[PDB]
């Protein structure tokens, strides 16, 4: 990450950029998985081997009560639902194809974040 991404703290018009990069993840067909926290009914195991879970809607609630000082720390809690999701699943299954997909999706959607920081 470069030095803008690191140090430069988020500010309004920043945080108008990231409800919108945040609502365009929970509207991906291939989101589903990671809307809601996991359910434990579903995964009795699951919250035994994930230490730090987390989904869209606790990054929403996040968004929305200005808990983000930098631009890593948003990056970091999206990244943590992937890398947890292809750690908790087989790579074979529908989830991990999930997290493949949503992923690359949210790359290209920083990228266009950072750029119109920047200009
Ligand atoms: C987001 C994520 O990684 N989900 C995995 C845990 C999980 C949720 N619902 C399920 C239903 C069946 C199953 F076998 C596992 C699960």
Same mark, same amino acid.
């Given at each position: 990450?470069? +030095?803008?991404?690191?140090? !430069?703290?988020? !500010? *309004? ?10 609502? &365009? ?13 996991? %359910?434990?009914?579903?995964?009795? %195991? ?13 990054? *929403? ?11 890593? *720390?948003?990056? +970091?809690?999206? !990244? ?10 087989? &790579? ?6 999930? +997290?493949?997909?949503? *992923? ?10 950072? +750029? &119109?920081? &920047?200009?």
């Amino acid at each position: 990450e470069d +030095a803008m991404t690191v140090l !430069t703290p988020l !500010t *309004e018009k920043d945080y108008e950029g990231l409800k919108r990069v945040l609502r &365009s993840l929970q509207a991906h067909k291939m989101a589903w998985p990671f809307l809601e926290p996991v %359910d434990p009914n579903d995964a009795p %195991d699951y919250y035994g081997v994930i230490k730090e879970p987390m989904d869209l809607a606790t990054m *929403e609630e996040r968004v929305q009560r200005r808990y983000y000082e930098k631009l890593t *720390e948003f990056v +970091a809690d999206m !990244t943590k639902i992937f890398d947890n999701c292809r750690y908790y699943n087989p &790579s074979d299954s529908p989830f991990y194809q999930c +997290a493949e997909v949503l *992923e690359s999706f949210f790359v290209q959607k920083l990228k266009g974040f950072k +750029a &119109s920081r &920047s200009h």
